[PDB]
Symmetry: D3
């Protein structure tokens, strides 16, 4: 089974699973999010596949997809919206600031790799 062990343990809406095998860097590049609930006719309320960029965006060889910062930017935008709205919380603000600091560190990774001419290459 390829079920992710998550920090949340109670009242989970969905489970997440690794899909396929290990790829470049030792990571997976496909995930499925699927609901802990079934519809009236016995099917998943949610069954959602996320495919990540696998290989350089410049080869046609590559599995072209999303990058982790895209997912974090989506979460960042939603948390900002929630904080502007009626159901804001301190827990949200702490989550949002850590999300933004993670994105800034991912951008650090992009910029030092640009400086070293190694972005888009399989090099440490």
């Amino acid at each position: 089974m390829k079920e992710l062990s998550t920090i949340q343990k109670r009242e989970k809406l969905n489970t997440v699973e690794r899909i396929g095998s290990e790829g470049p860097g030792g990571a997976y590049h496909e995930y499925v999010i699927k609901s802990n609930s079934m519809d009236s006719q016995g099917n998943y309320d949610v069954y959602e596949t996320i495919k990540f960029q696998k290989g350089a965006r410049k080869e046609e060889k590559s599995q072209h997809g999303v990058i982790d910062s895209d997912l974090l930017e989506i979460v960042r935008d939603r948390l900002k919206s929630f904080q502007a709205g009626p159901f804001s919380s301190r827990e949200n603000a702490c989550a949002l600031t850590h999300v933004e600091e993670a994105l800034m560190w991912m951008n650090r990774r992009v910029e030092d790799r640009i400086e070293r001419n190694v972005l888009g290459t399989n090099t440490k």
Copy 2:
């Protein structure tokens, strides 16, 4: 509708809001589309992500993903990259920040359980 992102250079994809504001004032559908293009003018990447919109117990809701799911995926990938040959301190700081975000997201869920407001449209 296009997201202004923290990354400014060498961006692979663009992210856009889909639809209108919903419960809590947020959007519940997003599109990620590649900045690169194929021969016929079709995006090389065009993926929609739909979020839970309305309570999961209600059959009329838009059932979908929740943000901690996406953060757990990113967490798992960062752990795999740190165990692999292309690890970095930048990766490690990002991973710890993602994990602390997930910890605060769980604190929210648990607080809302404590106050008997989880799954309700209330602060």
Copy 3:
């Protein structure tokens, strides 16, 4: 020596001191907090002893006691109360957020150890 070198250096109310010997894990399991002041009769204004859990809560020869998360939860509650009251501060708020993040990491440790089924055993 058994007197703790603390982060605070001036206007300390109390001193903290280790009691006994190193135990499981290389740590001490009993501490005393004693006042830096003495009463009219020449006695400590404060002399408090804290005994930690030492060995498995299941087996009877263990020294049964408190755990560190209990102490941080007390401090978290008091800081929350102070922030609601009239003598709140930014310094309090930073302290409380770090206390809660420490508690969340202690719970990460507990949840990692339940998942590995090592909780309550002398296993790294």
Copy 4:
């Protein structure tokens, strides 16, 4: 109920309770930590009271007691010892750095209050 809602939800050794009434600053100044487990004799295996300084130390009719930085310094010492011993973890390290940064902010509070000549007085 005076029982504290804690961060950890599963496998709790002990329960923590506030004791007394709201005091200076809106906080409680006594807490009890009691075991979730039982002897054969019918009593709690753990039942420990922690009384905090309530009112200034110089005033003779105050409830002299511990302060929160004492408790976090104990936890800091134990965490350092665990990290130097055989059962270390990244979760311990993250908790320890947060505990030390909380102690650093508590000291900032003390030092700021000395600056403003309000340490030991009921004022912001």
Copy 5:
């Protein structure tokens, strides 16, 4: 006085003073660092002024000078060097990561202000 109350309280090499009057945004734009020790001559061993950009750089009547990210980038370079050398420490590491995160947030400000077309203007 115009002397800064600093985090460091003991064994301080220098004092810092703000110079001039409060300017745009409510801040001071000139500072002096001077040694706590004097030479045989009687004058300070260190007396260093730092002027900050006051007014937009495009306007020639402005006081052109340094900006805060310059100073933090100097400190970041020095901490990186110390860590690569013989006298490294965990305290240095925590300081460096915080300096770098402060720089990332200063950059976030600049980029936000570019986004809103307010960079180099006297507005929030």
Copy 6:
């Protein structure tokens, strides 16, 4: 080259350069901040030199100068002022809290070295 590679890439007011050679502990002890702009006469609008303490302050052939805490205290004071003024921001607040945590870690280093009697000596 001796150019500092900075976290900010866009709309930079100034460049920062190392001057001289590596010194004690592996770090540079002199830095120039110079404008990315020039006046009506082809001369830098800005050209500060910052010289750091190099060698123990209490010996006399040492180069006496500033220390990194001095620069962060300046930045801390300015950020506090900007946050009290009309052009405050969340980005400023995050930068300021990181600056202050950096300073408290610098002070941790100083007090640790005092306690070990290594402050002012070339020793790890």
